[PDB]
Design a protein around this ligand. Structure first.
Ligand SMILES: CCS(=O)(=O)c1ccc2c(c1)-c1cn(C)c(=O)c3[nH]cc(c13)CN2CC1CC1
Length: 109
């Protein structure tokens, strides 16, 4: 059922927030601070920004019908990081390490 799938999605999100993954997951915890980090081009390149806090808020507000809608938002967060930043960047390697954690848990449900 859809109600059961969303419960598993909360579990994946919680593990993504845990201390174990904090070293590489932290730049995704909250929305990207464009003005403070000096990224003016970010709003022009990234049309739909996404982060773990926004996903956690959308989950609590029941904005996802099923696991696929939740999964679409998690993958959008990673896709935005891959698009804006060059492949050699540290935040891309961090995104890949976090996506490996997500894809492993999301597949096993
Ligand atoms: C509360 C988070 S923050 O203060 O907005 C924050 C703080 C830092 C931070 C980001 C966000 C960030 C996130 N993403 C999704 C990017 O695409 C991106 N591109 C370059 C950077 C970012 C700079 N870095 C990562 C840092 C070098 C290891």
């Amino acid at each position: 059922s859809h109600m059961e799938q969303l419960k598993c999605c909360s579990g994946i999100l919680k593990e993504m927030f845990a201390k174990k993954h904090a070293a590489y997951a932290w730049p995704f915890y909250k929305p990207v601070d464009v003005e403070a980090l000096g990224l003016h081009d970010y709003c022009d390149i990234i049309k739909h920004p996404m982060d773990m806090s926004t996903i956690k808020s959308k989950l609590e507000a029941r904005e996802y019908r099923d696991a696929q809608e939740f999964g679409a938002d998690v993958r959008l967060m990673f896709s935005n990081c891959y698009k804006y930043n060059p492949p050699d960047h540290e935040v891309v390697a961090m995104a890949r390490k976090l996506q490996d954690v997500f894809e492993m848990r999301f597949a096993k449900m």
